[PDB]
Scaffold this motif. Structure first.
Motif, mmCIF file in Angstrom:
data_model
loop_
_atom_site.group_PDB
_atom_site.id
_atom_site.type_symbol
_atom_site.label_atom_id
_atom_site.label_comp_id
_atom_site.label_asym_id
_atom_site.label_seq_id
_atom_site.Cartn_x
_atom_site.Cartn_y
_atom_site.Cartn_z
ATOM 1 N N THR A 254 25.723 -3.833 -30.486
ATOM 2 C CA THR A 254 24.235 -3.888 -30.789
ATOM 3 C C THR A 254 24.034 -2.876 -29.527
ATOM 4 O O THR A 254 23.171 -1.587 -29.388
ATOM 5 C CB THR A 254 23.525 -4.800 -30.475
ATOM 6 O OG1 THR A 254 24.038 -6.041 -29.515
ATOM 7 C CG2 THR A 254 23.979 -5.343 -32.205
ATOM 8 N N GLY A 255 25.401 -2.858 -28.319
ATOM 9 C CA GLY A 255 24.648 -2.812 -26.753
ATOM 10 C C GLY A 255 25.142 -3.400 -25.712
ATOM 11 O O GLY A 255 26.385 -3.019 -25.830
ATOM 12 N N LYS A 256 24.856 -4.180 -24.829
ATOM 13 C CA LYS A 256 25.114 -4.063 -23.748
ATOM 14 C C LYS A 256 26.382 -5.174 -23.508
ATOM 15 O O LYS A 256 27.931 -4.658 -22.479
ATOM 16 C CB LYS A 256 24.267 -4.767 -22.185
ATOM 17 C CG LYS A 256 23.730 -5.654 -23.349
ATOM 18 C CD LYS A 256 22.367 -5.446 -23.825
ATOM 19 C CE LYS A 256 21.345 -4.626 -22.452
ATOM 20 N NZ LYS A 256 19.901 -4.358 -22.848
#
Length: 316
Positions: free
Chosen positions: A206-208
């Motif tokens: 997704t992301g971080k």
DNA sequence: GCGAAATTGGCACGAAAATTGCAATAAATAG
DNA sequence: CTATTTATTGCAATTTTCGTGCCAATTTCG
């Protein structure tokens, strides 16, 4: 951009190296490499070729990687050395035969997709075919497969058989429906893998987040497949995600203590360092009380990889 | 200063795991 | 229809990676 590199230059560089490096790159093509040779770069700043050629090899070692190197191959060669040393033997071998011209295995082409030609989306190889796909909105979490669109291609024997026919089509369907069932289990195994790995790796795709540990022994004992057969799935199958397209072997990592990927662990040590401070064995005590049991020696090795000249010598 | 506990790094060994080679079985094609 | 070689699953061995333990070398504190 260049502002990113200039600020990192002063951290680990002192003396002429800092004064030289800032003036060192006024020579580049917007592709990131310089049009001038070291021969010419030496005479302009009133410095020898021993200093320039010595520092440039270190400058590419600071993120963003591979700035000054003139050749694409130096960029690719440095990417294999500085990034992928585990496979570095094989990867370097793929570049040479490619230069002279050559073919490549589907695995060797995918292994080379991780490399970048030059500094946004530039990359050496992008797959025409992808063996699955995965994505998430804030909504979760979609897995297409590939073979879900695929079915037995009717060969020339079935089409031409129309040249006891009632029995003939029976036998053809007998063999087909058997292989159609096994191909379903082969692709159903793909679905079992991703649905399992998504739980751990949600943040990464997704992301971080950063990669969470996964073991083939962990996964292959979760479902029917053995690790021996699972290992060839990950190597031979590729996937597309919201962030990039990866080998499917990139989602399996090794864990230390209660966690942890080697990366997530490295950041913790770098965070704890952020005269008085603890040297080595003392810092392992912070993490053991932090919930993660570690070894006194192990923090020393991770203290070497990331810059920590000493926890003691940081006191002086 | 002197001694004891230590920080740090090395040589490596061991354990947990992963990859590749091997063999057995189920299959397909050719004679 | 039978035999040979063709590929996939399961098993074993080897190599692969990563941590940790102890001792040696240089250090700090009581």
């Amino acid at each position: 951009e260049l502002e990113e590199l200039q600020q990192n230059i002063k951290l680990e560089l002192e003396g002429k190296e800092q004064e030289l490096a800032l003036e060192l790159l006024n020579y580049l093509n917007e592709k990131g490499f310089l049009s001038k040779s070291v021969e010419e770069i030496s005479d302009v700043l009133r410095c020898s070729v021993e200093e320039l050629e010595k520092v440039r090899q270190k400058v590419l070692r600071l993120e963003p990687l591979g700035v000054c190197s003139k050749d694409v191959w130096e960029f690719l060669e440095l990417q294999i050395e500085e990034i992928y040393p585990e496979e570095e033997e094989i990867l370097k071998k793929a570049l040479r035969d490619l230069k002279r011209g050559k073919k490549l295995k589907p695995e060797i082409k995918g292994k080379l997709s991780r490399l970048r030609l030059f500094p946004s989306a530039e990359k050496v190889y992008t797959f025409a075919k992808v063996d699955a796909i995965i994505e998430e909105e804030n909504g979760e979490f979609f897995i297409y497969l590939y073979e879900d669109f695929i079915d037995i291609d009717l060969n020339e024997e079935y089409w031409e058989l129309y040249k006891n026919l009632q029995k003939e089509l029976k036998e053809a369907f007998e063999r087909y429906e058997s292989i159609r069932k096994v191909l379903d289990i082969r692709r159903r195994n793909l679905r079992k893998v991703l649905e399992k790995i998504v739980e751990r790796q949600k943040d990464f795709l997704t992301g971080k987040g950063s990669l969470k540990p996964l073991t083939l022994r962990e996964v292959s004992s979760e479902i029917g497949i053995h690790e021996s057969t699972l290992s060839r799935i990950v190597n031979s199958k590729y996937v597309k995600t919201p962030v990039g397209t990866y080998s499917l072997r990139t989602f399996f990592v090794r864990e230390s203590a209660e966690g942890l990927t080697q990366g997530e662990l490295m950041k913790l040590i770098k965070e704890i360092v952020e005269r008085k401070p603890y040297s080595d064995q003392e810092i392992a005590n912070i993490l053991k009380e932090k919930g993660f049991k570690v070894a006194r020696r192990t923090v020393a090795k991770y203290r070497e990889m990331l810059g920590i000249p000493s926890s003691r010598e940081r006191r002086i």
